Paper text:
Dr adhesins are expressed on the surface of uropathogenic and diffusely adherent strains of Escherichia coli. The major adhesin subunit (DraE/AfaE) of these organelles mediates attachment of the bacterium to the surface of the host cell and possibly intracellular invasion through its recognition of the complement regulator decay-accelerating factor (DAF) and/or members of the carcinoembryonic antigen (CEA) family. The adhesin subunit of the Dr haemagglutinin, a Dr-family member, additionally binds type IV collagen and is inhibited in all its receptor interactions by the antibiotic chloram­phenicol (CLM). In this study, previous structural work is built upon by reporting the X-ray structures of DraE bound to two chloramphenicol derivatives: chloramphenicol succinate (CLS) and bromamphenicol (BRM).
A unique CLS cocrystal in space group C2 was obtained at a small-molecule concentration of 10 mM and could not be reproduced. Ordering of the whole ligand in the P3 forms is helped by crystal contacts from a neighbouring protein molecule (Gln47 and Leu49) to the ligand atoms C7 and C8 (in the phenyl ring) and one of the O atoms on the nitro moiety (the atom labelled O9B); this crystal contact is missing in the C2 form and the ‘head group’ of CLS adopted a number of conformations that were not traceable. Overall, the CLS–DraE complex structures imply that (i) substitutions at the primary hydroxyl do not significantly affect the mode of CLM binding and (ii) the nitrobenzene group is not required to bind DraE.
Residue numbers in the entry:
A (entry chain B), B (entry chain A): 0 to 139
C (entry chain C): 0 to 66, 69 to 139
Write the structure that this text describes.
Amino acid sequence: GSFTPSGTTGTTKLTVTEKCQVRVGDLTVAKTRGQLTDAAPIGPVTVQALGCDARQVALKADTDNFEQGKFFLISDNNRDKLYVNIRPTDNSAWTTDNGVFYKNDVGSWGGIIGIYVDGQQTNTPPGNYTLTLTGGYWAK
Amino acid sequence: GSFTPSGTTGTTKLTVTEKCQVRVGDLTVAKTRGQLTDAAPIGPVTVQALGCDARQVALKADTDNFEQGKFFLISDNNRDKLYVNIRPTDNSAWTTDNGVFYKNDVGSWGGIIGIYVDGQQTNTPPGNYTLTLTGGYWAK
Amino acid sequence: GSFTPSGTTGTTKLTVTEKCQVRVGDLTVAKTRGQLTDAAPIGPVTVQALGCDARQVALKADTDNFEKFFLISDNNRDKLYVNIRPTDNSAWTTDNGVFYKNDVGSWGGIIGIYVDGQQTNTPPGNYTLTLTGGYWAK
């Protein structure tokens, strides 16, 4: 299997906070650490393919966003991780392969990739966490 | 006194220009150097606290935005400074403590922190200036 | 000729893709490489001068955006050569990274960015052109 980068990069930002939470500036996604229970939604990643009627749509995470089997958001401190599962809201079939999440069937898919906490992680340190995904296509 | 970071970070960007001012791309805050008179408004910082009914809301400036006693926006050259005062528009009571601006009373405050020029600085070199504040809470 | 920086910096981003193009996150400008024919529009750059009734409006490109203007890949090798021209067809001049207006006045308008020479072999990637507002004097 091989990923060909071809499309834009979307960067999911999450701010983890304590119960008392102070939003400063533009609205962005924040969650308290008590909200980080297994399967809790973090946020959506919008996806739209064009010209892929005969290709398999895929997303590849940055190198520091996957440590095999698993995807995770990385802290700005380059240390703390928030493990997540990613899943299309339409329940179509996709596969995870070494940092690549690709759709099992060809077609110019459009949808939402939901990001959810993978295992309870209510001890996640407050800070700013990111997951970077780049669009492209997969082959075989 | 101790600040607990718990919330998002808002970055105020200011572009200082000459009289002939050429805005390129999307709207951002720009002011001519002649406009940097004592008390001149630079811009607002929106703040919204949640789950802090029993805590004191606070903002902490980045290390390079305060040189005790005083807050300032820092140039991208990391040299030039524009000193400012920050004050809530509702005139509520806050205290400054070594880079932290905290509310005197507990409660989930929402409001606007205005940034104002602290002393005439019409000789400010044209450039891009920033002040970064992070939401959290204080104690005592 | 001298450029005085005085105004904001606008950054034009272009994502070059293959035919099968996968957009992730919020809308941004993307073009397949087959779209990069000579004169193909890349995107506009809005410009608005104030207080320059007696000055010549100008834009200065970042050092890594002119040799000829070009967008530079995020990897820092690949270049997409372009020409910039105001949509209103007003008269401007290029001087070593500076694009300045031939007459004084607080011009407002759109600086169009167009492909300069066929470049359909442009590697996929993220390309940027950074322009800073200010004014020109001889």
